[PDB]
């Protein structure tokens, strides 16, 4: 076939019922994730090829960066609740991997302040039980799928993207192959 189990994707031994249609996992500590976001724009190019009716979900993970890793998962929950993902994603990635100016929860907070979220609004969100359950959701989705590595994408709780099985000689070709695969898995 052109799309083969174990080549552009793997199938989960243990499918996850009720899962988001397109589910992406990342870490602000993850070097390929940085690439996926700032150089490749994977999430974005996947949207452009997804059918109508398809919701896209992106969660942060705890297993990189120890204590700061967990802080980042709570901040991403804050980012999701206030709807400010598109304003903090780039400065978080760069504060962690490029400038290395993010070393504490207070430094994460600064990124949100600079992006224009008000202190009061951030600290209220940070401490809210709505953010507590969003953190819970991020952890459960990762737990549900055996997750030990990022970046990772899952389609309909049954298929997992396998980017190691795509040519990387050309970055644009890699992205389209990735996106087309997501669409194929989408229609499966």
DSSP annotation string for 141-169: HHHHTT---SSEEEETTTEEE-GGGS--S
Q: How far is Cα of residue 70 from the mean position of the Cα atoms in its chain?
A: 14
Domains of the chain: 1-188 (3.40.30.10)
> 40, 188 in Cβ contact below 8 A?
no
* Tokens standing for residue 80: 């999701």
β-strand partners of 59: 25
Place of tokens 């996106």: 179
What are 57's two structure tokens? 């979900």
Which of 187, 168, 78 minimizes the C-alpha distance to 130? Answer: 78
**Both structure tokens of 93:** 């990635």
Name the β-bridge partners of 135: none
Task: Give the residue from 136, 188, 165 showing the smallest Cα distance to 22.
Answer: 188
**89 three-state secondary structure:** helix
CB atoms within 10 A of CB 105: 16
In this structure, what token pair is assigned to residue 120?
């009061």
Taking CA atoms, 3 is separated from 10, 82, 165, 178, in Å, by 11, 38, 11, 11
Q: How far apart are the C-alpha atoms of 97 and 91, rounded to whole Å?
A: 10
Residue 58, strand partner residues: 24
Resolution (A): 2.0
């Amino acid at each position: 076939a052109q799309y083969e189990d174990g080549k552009q994707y793997t199938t989960l031994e243990k499918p996850v019922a009720g899962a988001p249609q397109v589910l992406e996992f990342f870490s602000f500590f993850c070097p390929h994730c940085y690439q996926f976001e700032e150089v490749l724009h994977i999430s974005d190019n996947v949207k452009k090829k997804l059918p109508e009716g398809v919701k896209m979900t992106k969660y942060h993970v705890n297993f990189m960066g120890g204590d700061l890793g967990k802080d980042l998962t709570q901040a991403w929950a804050v980012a999701m609740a206030l709807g400010v993902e598109d304003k903090v994603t780039v400065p978080l990635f760069e504060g962690v991997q490029k400038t290395q100016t993010i070393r504490s929860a207070s430094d994460i907070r600064d990124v949100f302040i600079n992006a224009g979220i008000k202190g009061e609004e951030y600290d209220a969100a940070w401490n809210s039980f709505v953010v507590k359950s969003l953190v819970a959701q991020q952890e459960k989705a990762a737990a549900d799928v055996q997750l030990r590595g990022v970046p990772a994408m899952f389609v309909n709780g049954k298929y997992q993207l396998n980017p190691q099985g795509m040519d990387t000689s050309n970055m644009d070709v890699f992205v389209q192959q990735y996106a087309d695969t997501v669409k194929y898995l989408s229609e499966k």
